[PDB]
mmCIF file with all atom_site columns, C-alpha atoms and ligand atoms in Angstrom:
data_model
loop_
_atom_site.group_PDB
_atom_site.id
_atom_site.type_symbol
_atom_site.label_atom_id
_atom_site.label_alt_id
_atom_site.label_comp_id
_atom_site.label_asym_id
_atom_site.label_entity_id
_atom_site.label_seq_id
_atom_site.pdbx_PDB_ins_code
_atom_site.Cartn_x
_atom_site.Cartn_y
_atom_site.Cartn_z
_atom_site.occupancy
_atom_site.B_iso_or_equiv
_atom_site.pdbx_formal_charge
_atom_site.auth_seq_id
_atom_site.auth_comp_id
_atom_site.auth_asym_id
_atom_site.auth_atom_id
_atom_site.pdbx_PDB_model_num
ATOM   1  C  CA  . UNK B 1 1  ? -11.034 146.086 130.600 1.00 0.00 ? 1   UNK B CA  1
ATOM   2  C  CA  . UNK B 1 2  ? -12.070 142.638 131.642 1.00 0.00 ? 2   UNK B CA  1
ATOM   3  C  CA  . UNK B 1 3  ? -12.710 139.530 129.518 1.00 0.00 ? 3   UNK B CA  1
ATOM   4  C  CA  . UNK B 1 4  ? -15.341 136.922 130.299 1.00 0.00 ? 4   UNK B CA  1
ATOM   5  C  CA  . UNK B 1 5  ? -15.642 133.401 128.808 1.00 0.00 ? 5   UNK B CA  1
ATOM   6  C  CA  . UNK B 1 6  ? -18.827 131.672 127.806 1.00 0.00 ? 6   UNK B CA  1
ATOM   7  C  CA  . UNK B 1 7  ? -18.404 128.402 129.679 1.00 0.00 ? 7   UNK B CA  1
ATOM   8  C  CA  . UNK B 1 8  ? -20.594 126.634 127.038 1.00 0.00 ? 8   UNK B CA  1
ATOM   9  C  CA  . UNK B 1 9  ? -18.885 127.521 123.753 1.00 0.00 ? 9   UNK B CA  1
ATOM   10 C  CA  . UNK B 1 10 ? -15.692 129.438 124.529 1.00 0.00 ? 10  UNK B CA  1
ATOM   11 C  CA  . UNK B 1 11 ? -16.760 132.806 123.119 1.00 0.00 ? 11  UNK B CA  1
ATOM   12 C  CA  . UNK B 1 12 ? -14.916 135.656 124.848 1.00 0.00 ? 12  UNK B CA  1
ATOM   13 C  CA  . UNK B 1 13 ? -16.932 138.700 125.868 1.00 0.00 ? 13  UNK B CA  1
ATOM   14 C  CA  . UNK B 1 14 ? -14.185 141.313 125.728 1.00 0.00 ? 14  UNK B CA  1
ATOM   15 C  CA  . UNK B 1 15 ? -15.381 144.507 127.411 1.00 0.00 ? 15  UNK B CA  1
ATOM   16 C  CA  . UNK B 1 16 ? -13.031 146.477 125.131 1.00 0.00 ? 16  UNK B CA  1
ATOM   17 C  CA  . UNK B 1 17 ? -14.762 145.055 122.067 1.00 0.00 ? 17  UNK B CA  1
ATOM   18 C  CA  . UNK B 1 18 ? -18.349 145.029 123.238 1.00 0.00 ? 18  UNK B CA  1
ATOM   19 C  CA  . UNK B 1 19 ? -20.800 143.240 120.931 1.00 0.00 ? 19  UNK B CA  1
ATOM   20 C  CA  . UNK B 1 20 ? -21.894 145.896 118.412 1.00 0.00 ? 20  UNK B CA  1
ATOM   21 C  CA  . UNK B 1 21 ? -23.665 143.508 116.076 1.00 0.00 ? 21  UNK B CA  1
ATOM   22 C  CA  . UNK B 1 22 ? -26.034 142.800 118.958 1.00 0.00 ? 22  UNK B CA  1
ATOM   23 C  CA  . UNK B 1 23 ? -26.513 146.318 120.345 1.00 0.00 ? 23  UNK B CA  1
ATOM   24 C  CA  . UNK B 1 24 ? -23.502 146.645 122.680 1.00 0.00 ? 24  UNK B CA  1
ATOM   25 C  CA  . UNK B 1 25 ? -20.918 149.372 122.182 1.00 0.00 ? 25  UNK B CA  1
ATOM   26 C  CA  . UNK B 1 26 ? -17.217 148.767 122.867 1.00 0.00 ? 26  UNK B CA  1
ATOM   27 C  CA  . UNK B 1 27 ? -16.383 149.476 126.484 1.00 0.00 ? 27  UNK B CA  1
ATOM   28 C  CA  . UNK B 1 28 ? -19.606 148.086 127.998 1.00 0.00 ? 28  UNK B CA  1
ATOM   29 C  CA  . UNK B 1 29 ? -18.859 146.223 131.233 1.00 0.00 ? 29  UNK B CA  1
ATOM   30 C  CA  . UNK B 1 30 ? -20.342 142.746 131.496 1.00 0.00 ? 30  UNK B CA  1
ATOM   31 C  CA  . UNK B 1 31 ? -22.476 143.855 134.453 1.00 0.00 ? 31  UNK B CA  1
ATOM   32 C  CA  . UNK B 1 32 ? -24.052 146.484 132.225 1.00 0.00 ? 32  UNK B CA  1
ATOM   33 C  CA  . UNK B 1 33 ? -25.162 144.115 129.502 1.00 0.00 ? 33  UNK B CA  1
ATOM   34 C  CA  . UNK B 1 34 ? -28.945 143.831 129.548 1.00 0.00 ? 34  UNK B CA  1
ATOM   35 C  CA  . UNK B 1 35 ? -30.238 141.023 131.686 1.00 0.00 ? 35  UNK B CA  1
ATOM   36 C  CA  . UNK B 1 36 ? -31.460 139.217 128.571 1.00 0.00 ? 36  UNK B CA  1
ATOM   37 C  CA  . UNK B 1 37 ? -28.265 139.655 126.521 1.00 0.00 ? 37  UNK B CA  1
ATOM   38 C  CA  . UNK B 1 38 ? -27.005 136.212 125.426 1.00 0.00 ? 38  UNK B CA  1
ATOM   39 C  CA  . UNK B 1 39 ? -23.818 134.771 124.040 1.00 0.00 ? 39  UNK B CA  1
ATOM   40 C  CA  . UNK B 1 40 ? -23.842 135.737 120.339 1.00 0.00 ? 40  UNK B CA  1
ATOM   41 C  CA  . UNK B 1 41 ? -22.475 132.315 119.390 1.00 0.00 ? 41  UNK B CA  1
ATOM   42 C  CA  . UNK B 1 42 ? -24.443 129.750 121.387 1.00 0.00 ? 42  UNK B CA  1
ATOM   43 C  CA  . UNK B 1 43 ? -27.266 131.756 123.000 1.00 0.00 ? 43  UNK B CA  1
ATOM   44 C  CA  . UNK B 1 44 ? -26.208 131.027 126.572 1.00 0.00 ? 44  UNK B CA  1
ATOM   45 C  CA  . UNK B 1 45 ? -27.523 133.423 129.274 1.00 0.00 ? 45  UNK B CA  1
ATOM   46 C  CA  . UNK B 1 46 ? -25.292 135.782 131.171 1.00 0.00 ? 46  UNK B CA  1
ATOM   47 C  CA  . UNK B 1 47 ? -25.228 133.280 134.017 1.00 0.00 ? 47  UNK B CA  1
ATOM   48 C  CA  . UNK B 1 48 ? -22.977 131.000 131.917 1.00 0.00 ? 48  UNK B CA  1
ATOM   49 C  CA  . UNK B 1 49 ? -20.101 133.495 131.697 1.00 0.00 ? 49  UNK B CA  1
ATOM   50 C  CA  . UNK B 1 50 ? -16.966 133.381 133.911 1.00 0.00 ? 50  UNK B CA  1
ATOM   51 C  CA  . UNK B 1 51 ? -14.795 136.475 134.485 1.00 0.00 ? 51  UNK B CA  1
ATOM   52 C  CA  . UNK B 1 52 ? -11.213 135.774 133.390 1.00 0.00 ? 52  UNK B CA  1
ATOM   53 C  CA  . UNK B 1 53 ? -9.328  136.805 136.480 1.00 0.00 ? 53  UNK B CA  1
ATOM   54 C  CA  . UNK B 1 54 ? -8.166  135.154 139.576 1.00 0.00 ? 54  UNK B CA  1
HETATM 55 FE FE1 . FE  Q 2 .  ? -21.510 130.723 124.136 1.00 0.00 ? 101 FE  Q FE1 1
#
């Protein structure tokens, strides 16, 4: 699945990993994260993530 970078801190949202500590099971697509999900490291909004693909 896809990976997304937090353009603030460099955290990688890996869709394969999810973010279980913050309520997100492995395999959750970035688009499906709640609108108010934030980077677990720096707190940046979803707007601050870049999909890692051309
Ligand atoms: Fe971040």
